[PDB]
Amino acid sequence: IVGGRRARPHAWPFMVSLQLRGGHFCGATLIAPNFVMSAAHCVANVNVRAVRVVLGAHNLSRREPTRQVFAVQRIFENGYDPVNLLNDIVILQLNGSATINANVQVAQLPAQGRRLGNGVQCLAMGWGLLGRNRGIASVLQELNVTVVTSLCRRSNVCTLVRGRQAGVCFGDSGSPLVCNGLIHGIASFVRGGCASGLYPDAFAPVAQFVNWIDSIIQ
């Protein structure tokens, strides 16, 4: 997240870090005690057996006893198209069930088909790059963003920060976009580099996938 702010610790208890060999590479969202959702492109070319699903995290540079770590048992896909980055969503079934507590909680999802228009105010978040040269965040970042339809496909939810250069960045893919308390996006791609101030950030449109999500988390 470029131009955001540190989240209060455990403000977003559905927020997940996906890690390989102890390094964060993508976000995810806890959607049931034994399932997370992320971007399909995050796991498309990764050793899934090596992915660690880290719940309850805030500062990835510190030892945190609030954390719960799981492996991926199974993946569920829904027509990911890597050339066009369409249907950029995956569900990862965990090898066990999270202990739900103040710091680890399931997210709330919108109704199937709900489409956000221009001007909805959302919060993006993640542990991705902080900007040019500064690397992956240590502390979870959040960012106020606004939904836009200009320079967005109908197959995405897009957002833009007005009046300054800010937005999501590499390592934020898979992270939730929260709008009126509900997870309406999964971070998918940028254009023109991160935080261009021109192209909106593109998210997988969670509401288009809710019946499918519901069918899996049973």
Ligand X SMILES: *[C@@H]1O[C@H](CO[C@@H]2O[C@@H](C)[C@@H](O)[C@@H](O)[C@@H]2O)[C@@H](O)[C@H](O)[C@H]1NC(C)=O
Query: Under the rule (CB under 6 A), what is the footprint of ligand X?
Result: 50, 52, 69-71, 95-96
Q: What is the token pair recorded at 91?
A: 């569900």
**23 or 96, CB closer to ligand X?**
96
Q: How far is CA 28 from CA 63, 92, 104, in A?
A: 20, 9, 13
The residues that bridge with 53 in the sheet, in sequence order, are 18, 70
Q: Is 201 a known active-site residue?
A: no
**12 or 70, CB closer to ligand X?**
70
Give me the least distance between CB of 48 and ligand X, in Å please. 9
Give me the least distance between CB of 213 and ligand X, in Å please. 22
What are the residues whose beta carbons fall under 8 Å from the beta carbon of 145, sequence distance 6 or more? 121, 122, 123, 124, 159, 160, 161, 167, 177, 201
Of 41, 58, 172, 188, the active-site residue reads: 41
**21 or 162, CB closer to ligand X?**
21
Q: Is 173 a known active-site residue?
A: yes
Give me the least distance between CB of 152 and ligand X, in Å please. 35
Q: Is 172 a known active-site residue?
A: no
φ/ψ bin of 48: left (φ > 0), alpha (ψ from -120 to 50), beta (otherwise): alpha
Positions marked active-site: 41, 88, 173
